[PDB]
Design a protein around this ligand. Structure first.
Ligand SMILES: C=CC(C)(C)OC[C@H]1O[C@H](O[C@@H]2C3=C([C@H](C)COC(C)=O)C[C@H](O)[C@]3(C)/C=C3/[C@@H](COC)CC[C@H]3[C@@H](C)[C@H]2O)[C@H](O)[C@@H](OC(C)=O)[C@@H]1O
Ligand SMILES: C=CC(C)(C)OC[C@H]1O[C@H](O[C@@H]2C3=C([C@H](C)COC(C)=O)C[C@H](O)[C@]3(C)/C=C3/[C@@H](COC)CC[C@H]3[C@@H](C)[C@H]2O)[C@H](O)[C@@H](OC(C)=O)[C@@H]1O
Lengths: 226, 6, 225, 6
């Protein structure tokens, strides 16, 4: 099928709420080894976000039930299901990260700052999703990797992008969240979110709906954290 | 509740 | 594996909104060749209903888009849309045949003669899934599965006529699905309205939230028809 | 509209 047919299949799967198929179609488009358009980038991001979000929500449900429940066989089954879904989610994240390192980040030119920040934010996001379910010695690495991606995406977006750009704002939001939840460092989380929010407010006249949606998310997080 | 991401 | 842990696995899958796993767990429980309790029965039916319902919703969305694209006439888009719709269709048909095999080889087969309630439940399931097959079938196979759904619905209706309460949720749901089969599959609306009003009127004389909701659904069906 | 089932 032609590339346009694959994009149409991704949109079809999104209409049918079959996000596995949407992610697979966008993965084929990525594997064509050509740079992705704005809409194609957004389709890939949304598809894999929904795919991994189903698994994250299932994992949270079962992990909560696991701690909420003297029966050893019941607990054994609950843990088996918990790590079955753990492995499913980790496989989704590994797929996304290998797509990012082999095709998307690689094909970015030295000056494709916007899409490079996009893909590095995706890298930080999926390493953070790995860190959410990682325990013990294996956690420290994935955490590190996420911090390595976000921070890089930070330095680029702070230097080459407007403060009210939705990609810079979204990266700031997810970076703040990574500092709050994964690092238990609320000081830098609040400082990051507040600096991004204030820098976007200071240039609000140069806008738009996605930008202000992300800004409202930033303020909601800041209100939750204080 | 969990913090918001986008 | 252990049966109690399999049932709690189905419950966990339901809580995690993973109905494929729920259906698999209840299928294993059924394949243990022991009769299902009322709770286990409802678990199996809910799991497979959600699975095949996701399939049916996706199929309906893609069929709508396919009719629009067919009107437009673009050959490549039409080709891809049709291929995707048929992928979803074959998934749906596989789920339906899984359910029907479970019903024929395990569930209906093992009911003793005094188990009229289980008979009505499982025969309503058989009719429902043959109707889901008929929703996507064409040509002679459509008539085939339509006849199968009619046979299952008829047998269940005559057993529930005799051994079940007019207010029972299984009887009311069977009447609802049977009238829907008459209206949407056979396109014989007079039979569908007669059956639905017969059930609705047999229910008013004898008067439990599920029965109330099924009667409300019957009334809404009659107003929409 | 589609008829309601249960
Ligand atoms: C292909 C388009 C689909 C998938 C239907 O929509 C994706 C969305 O794509 C864009 O929105 C993006 C975007 C979203 C916006 C914040 C949503 O805004 C509104 C008003 O709905 C949500 C999406 O997840 C997405 C793609 C995510 C991100 C995120 C990606 O990181 C890798 C970083 C910030 C943000 C950016 C890229 C947003 O620009 C567009 O601006 C949105 O349209 C409008 C008018 O806001 C469209 O809904
Ligand atoms: C698996 C059981 C769980 C998920 C815990 O509950 C599912 C539900 O299971 C039962 O509900 C059944 C039932 C449903 C009721 C109509 C829902 O009622 C309410 C108020 O939620 C919907 C389900 O699809 C189900 C199983 C369907 C049928 C249908 C099955 O075809 C073979 C025939 C009629 C009907 C009967 C069997 C209903 O009794 C119970 O009566 C419901 O309890 C209440 C308060 O209504 C419970 O929520």
């Amino acid at each position: 099928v032609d590339r346009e047919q694959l994009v149409q299949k991704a949109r079809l799967a999104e209409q049918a709420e079959r996000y596995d198929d949407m992610a697979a179609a966008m993965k084929n488009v990525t594997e064509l080894n050509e740079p992705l358009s704005n809409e194609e980038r957004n389709l890939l991001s949304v598809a894999y976000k929904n795919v991994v979000g189903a698994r994250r929500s299932s994992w949270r449900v079962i992990s909560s039930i696991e701690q909420k429940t003297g029966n050893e066989k019941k607990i054994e089954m609950v843990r088996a299901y918990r790590e079955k879904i753990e492995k499913e989610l980790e496989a989704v994240c590994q797929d996304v990260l290998s797509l990012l390192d082999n095709y998307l980040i690689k094909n970015c030119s030295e000056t494709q700052y916007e899409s490079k920040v996009f893909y590095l934010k995706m890298k930080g996001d999926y390493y953070r999703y790995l860190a959410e379910v990682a325990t013990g010695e294996k956690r420290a690495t994935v955490v590190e990797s996420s911090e390595k991606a976000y921070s890089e995406a930070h330095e680029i977006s702070k230097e080459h992008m407007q403060p009210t750009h939705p990609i810079r704002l979204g990266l700031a939001l997810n970076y703040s969240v990574f500092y709050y939840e994964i690092q238990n460092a609320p000081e830098q989380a609040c400082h990051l979110a507040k600096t991004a929010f204030d820098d976007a407010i200071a240039e609000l006249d140069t806008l738009y709906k996605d930008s202000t949606l992300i800004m409202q998310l930033l303020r909601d997080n800041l209100t939750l954290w204080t | 509740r969990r913090s918001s991401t986008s």
